[PDB]
Design brief:
25 residues, elongated, fungicide, Spinigerin
């Protein structure tokens, strides 16, 4: 069921912290 970008979700979910720290919102 590989629609598209079938990974980013994982990155944002896992990186979540790293993401908010890196970015802001």
């Amino acid at each position: 069921h590989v629609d598209k970008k079938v990974a980013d979700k994982v990155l944002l979910l896992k990186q979540l912290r790293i993401m908010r720290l890196l970015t802001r919102l």
